[PDB]
Amino acid sequence: SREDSVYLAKLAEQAERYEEMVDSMKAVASSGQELSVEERNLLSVAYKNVIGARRASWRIVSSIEQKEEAKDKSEHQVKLIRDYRSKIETELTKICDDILSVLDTHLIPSATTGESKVFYYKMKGDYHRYLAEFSSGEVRDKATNASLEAYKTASEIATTELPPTHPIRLGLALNFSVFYYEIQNSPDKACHLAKQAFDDAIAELDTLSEESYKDSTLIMQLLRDNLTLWTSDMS
């Protein structure tokens, strides 16, 4: 049953077991049916918490590598950290490949609404961005361009099909502005995108209902927080 797999994903989220939450939601997304707003959000939460733990682990092991890579040890010990980091990077890769495979084969082709189209292309940009984080050389550029075009596609649909105050559109602008700053190293693009999205939303904020207001203003503060910190780093 579909509503059973969705319910199990809820329990898995409460129990904070996100590997099972993914399995449940992946099964739902693997069906031809278009996901509801709740199932859409559950699927995203599932994969973000799964990819989040590995990313967090990766940064730590990378820091340990970099720290011990200065005089603290040599070769074989550093070798252990690198092989352990690579194991995580392999784990990160298959998680990204998994959701992207679901996105390309299932979600994106089956999306009727422009709201879900922006959402799915945003995710596509996100996990290609995660790939570009630990990647190096030519395989990093591939993930960078894949993330860029996925973000661009979502942006063209969001601008046309969605109001500036829409959570998915604001969230897309948040993540894409991050992509510009963190990955492509383009502070001008990043600041312009985050500020523009923030400004377009401000005007219509008073036209939003309560639940829409909370969702929108949450991301808008994140947009402001990024603009704040980016300003500090440039100084």
């Binding site: 939460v45 973000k48 948040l174 963190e182 994140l222 990024n226």
Partner: peptide, 6 residues
Amino acid sequence: TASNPK
């Protein structure tokens, strides 16, 4: 830097 926490 913070991304969308959905």
